[PDB]
Write a protein that binds this ligand. Sequence first.
Ligand SMILES: O=C1CCCC2=C1C1(CCCCC1)N=C(Nc1nc3ccccc3o1)N2
Ligand SMILES: Cc1c(C(=O)NCC2CCC2)cnn1C
Ligand SMILES: OC[C@H]1O[C@@H](O)[C@H](O)[C@@H](O)[C@H]1O
Length: 392
Amino acid sequence: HAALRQPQVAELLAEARRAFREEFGAEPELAVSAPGRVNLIGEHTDYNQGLVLPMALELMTVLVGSPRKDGLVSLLTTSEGADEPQRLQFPLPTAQRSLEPGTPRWANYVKGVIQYYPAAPLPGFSAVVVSSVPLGGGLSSSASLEVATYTFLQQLCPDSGTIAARAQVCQQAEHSFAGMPCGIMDQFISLMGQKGHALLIDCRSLETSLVPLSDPKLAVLITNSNVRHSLASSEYPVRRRQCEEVARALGKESLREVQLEELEAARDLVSKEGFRRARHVVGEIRRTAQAAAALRRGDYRAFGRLMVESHRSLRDDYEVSCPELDQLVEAALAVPGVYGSRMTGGGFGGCTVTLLEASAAPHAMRHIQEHYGGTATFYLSQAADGAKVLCL
Ligand SMILES: O=C1CCCC2=C1C1(CCCCC1)N=C(Nc1nc3ccccc3o1)N2
Ligand SMILES: Cc1c(C(=O)NCC2CCC2)cnn1C
Ligand SMILES: OC[C@H]1O[C@@H](O)[C@H](O)[C@@H](O)[C@H]1O
């Protein structure tokens, strides 16, 4: 129970290209990659036009492939947790006949991005898909597969848009083809990550700022609870609706426009539950601004305190934690050298994120595992690059 090895892109490339040479009988022409993500702080704020502070991970999805001349798409994935079958072929969608979600589920992410890809003419293509992002494990495996697909389609047929327009295609694939009405964060960080930086994203204006996060004395420890309660899927849209009810009641376009003071004075305009949801949201936006300021001046102790307040708010007000994540966090915070820890992503399972002195990392891992009633998985990750292309 040491940290799980993260394969370099080169091992992933070598594996994908071999599988491709075997599967299709020729060398692939193209390779792309897009990372998974951990959100340092700013949870359940993106769809509230809030602030988020994710970083791209050294875990990533790689596509290798070649355009076809017959208008068909032919896919193979090797990812272990992928659902059967591992292969799927389908014709390109047309104005007459669209793609539709189905089986196997892993291909719905690719189909969705193809369906909403904005530029024409898109040729068909053959592609192999491999990934080190744990599938469905809370680090945005699906966003990385969407953005990798998008980054591949740009090579088949360049688009002429902005990065946020690409994120929104990928978000639409997730909404329509995976049935998960996500905000913009995961797609945007997968696109926009830079090595050694976190990305402050303003989800109202779509301004982004690269915040340096690279200090050998510091580490980021990701802990996978390896649990995912069914609520991760069904209660996420419930939270979106509750935030929208509160913004409507207060006559605000979004909770970005609402402050705690304003909220407390309109306490009689919303449900008790709604008040709790919106108090989290307004507070988390302020905490994300404060955390970004702290990171910049190298104030990790303060950054870690804000992380802990974010977890408590998520646990108690937004109510999207779970006993597994809580036990993970309470264990991390008992380790000397740990600045702060909190659940990351949507909640009801998945991962926690911990900011700690680098030297403290193996102690945190032994202790967190021992106080965890389940089986934990660990990643030590630096801030990674976002989507990349390599001609083969
Ligand atoms: O079960 C659901 C529910 C929760 C979110 C989660 C999914 C599935 C569906 C099919 C396989 C298991 C998980 N996978 C995506 N992500 C993803 N599947 C990939 C396949 C190849 C490469 C990259 C990939 O990313 N996320
Ligand atoms: C900038 C970059 C790359 C790259 O040159 N191309 C991406 C494809 C090669 C296989 C995936 C890989 N990893 N990173 C971070
Ligand atoms: O911050 C909570 C997050 O839950 C996700 O993982 C969803 O995909 C994101 O858009 C964001 O809303």
